[PDB]
């Protein structure tokens, strides 16, 4: 259905040609129906994925254009932020995108509640979770628009090693 | 969404303008009604607003004697420990301070995560009602305990170390005791082997951190014996192994003090009570309880499910008013924001899926 | 890595296994050597008293290692102290703002539930 230039995927990412060749093999393992794209069900058919509270966030982040499936360029770009060769900013950007459900570049009150609730379940009552979301926004929202920009996010998490969290040792 | 839980009241997200902060009735004082609801909504002051309140309170407190003397009627209150939402209930049941005399026995801060709201609102009340509301020092109003527990962290999170330091200086100005209605010694903690007459309180240099030993320590730290009133040994004082400092004092010690100083009872706080109060053995001489403990923090620590109480003394009746806890907003441990809280787990979840995909 | 001192035995029959949902009350404190008789529990950093009961899958590595191993050795209703050295908790990294680098943790725990069962 499509074409792509492997050298451009290489130069546009943190990966070298050998790594991208290996990534193509992993992509084919995922692409069970050999369509050339990873459909939602092809992610969710992995038990380690369907049982993970952030599965729908990771799928959505991979699907850069929001078109409903993941092509090889999107697969490589999504993984590139986790390279040990990657920088501090792109790892913070990936973390920001976990919370920014509608991809508009700001975390809203409701987005932050929804994503946190995915992970905490009934460990917090809705009122409790809403209260600490509200106060985090109150503290992070320096320009007063009720939402959290990428710059406001990075300021809040200065003392967290987000780079360590957002790296994979082996590709 | 824009918001998921619409029925949950949002906090006050902005600091008051100076126009909002100052009272329209008396522009030299803060707007109390405004402050009361602002803190109820988890709102913050500006640093300059907070420093003004703390410093204005310090100027009033430092002019007061070590030993206050005031008549009844009055509402006497024990520990509050930062439980602002219960402090609101305390005033509902104890009387509006616009028309009610108050005496607090200390421990305004620590454990509860609304300690700075308790201090700023009580200090604002002191500024409005300097001749009808009084504040004593508790053992928590000092640097050592506020650093060990939560108040220093709370001030640094919500305000600044400068605000914390201003509170510490204000706490050094808090009076240490009161004689209430020429009848009751009111202190936070307890008697002392060095507390012979009331002149001993007056001689203290209170404007300093409490020492680890000595009369000033004991006033803030001492407890009645566990078997107060049914002792076997004749000792007046024994080392307090529960606190690790100061003393337990006995019923005979309390009777001796009261008789020597022509007082009826010691009213104190400092120990949590399931009922919010405890009355100890009556004296032979007058038949008043020799000691009363009053404790005003209900469901203390979110743990004990105890009642709180205040004492309302008027027309020669000691009215005991208990109240139960009120719900309060939730904070993560150490005031942590939800990104700091969640990001470690977020990292684990994401990389667990990438590993599954790649391996 | 972790030691478990029993304070009240549970029912001695229902024990969590890998993959079970467990329900736990706890108080977690920093280790303080000056406090034997408080089980070396110093300053509290968290507890369920102030929030609500704690729920997690057990034995699959989504909580710290000391919990993941010790909880499999509890029975329903058991109340115990877990003393966990840093390499079975948060290690060098600690937890920013809450758990210092290389901290030994002490938890008082009570196993309230395993899947549908309640103590
Ligand atoms: C979106 C929210 C995040 C999500 C939070 C919740 C479901 C709320 C739940 C009540 C946690 C508490 O929230 C108030 C708070 O509990 C502590 O105070 C605590 O008492 C503690 O030590 N516990 C909790 C009880 C089980 C043992 C241990 C834990 O293993 O906790 C786990 C933990 C932090 C594991 C890390 C994960 C990162 C790895 O790198 C690290 O590897 C070393 C181990 C928790 C249960 C995670 O499974 C789930 C989450 O993290 C932590 C000190 C900080 C923690 O907040 C994060
Ligand atoms: Ca496919
Ligand atoms: Ca796509
Ligand atoms: Ca958004
Ligand atoms: Ca903003
Ligand atoms: Fe106290
Ligand atoms: Zn006290």
Numbering used by the authors:
A (entry chain B): 1 to 171
B (entry chain A): 30 to 388
C (entry chain C): 11 to 129
Sentences from the paper on this structure:
Calcineurin (CN) is a Ca2+/calmodulin (CaM)-dependent, serine, threonine-specific protein phosphatase that controls T-cell activation and is critical for numerous cellular functions. The CN complex is composed of a catalytic (CnA) and regulatory (CnB) subunit that binds Ca2+, and is activated by Ca2+–CaM2. Here we report the crystal structures of fungal CN ternary complexes with FKBP12-FK506 from highly clinically relevant human fungal pathogens: A. fumigatus, C. albicans, C. neoformans, and Coccidioides immitis, reflecting the common invasive fungal pathogens, including a mold, yeasts, and a dimorphic endemic fungus. Each complex has three components: (1) the CnA subunit with catalytic domain and the BBH, (2) the CnB subunit, with four EF hands bound to Ca2+ and wrapping around the BBH, and (3) FKBP12 bound to FK506, interfacing with CnA/CnB.
Crystal structures of CN–FK506-FKBP12 ternary complexes from four fungi were determined by molecular replacement to resolutions between 1.85 and 3.30 Å. Despite sequence variations between the mammalian and fungal counterparts of CN and FKBP12, the X-ray characterized ternary complexes reveal high structural homology. A flexible hinge in CnA separates the catalytic domain from the BBH, which forms the composite surface for FKBP12-FK506-complex binding. Fungal CnB structures are also conserved, with two well-resolved C-terminal EF-hands close to the FKBP12-FK506 binding surface and the two distal N-terminal EF-hands showing varying degrees of disorder, suggesting interaction with FKBP12-FK506 may stabilize the C-terminal EF-hands. The interface between CN and FKBP12-FK506 complexes is conserved across fungi, but differences are notable in the binding surfaces of FKBP12 and CnA in fungi versus mammalian proteins. While the CnA and CnB interacting residues within 5–8 Å of FK506 in human and fungi are conserved, fungal FKBP12s differed in 4 of the 17 interacting residues, as well as other residues surrounding the 40s and 80s loops.
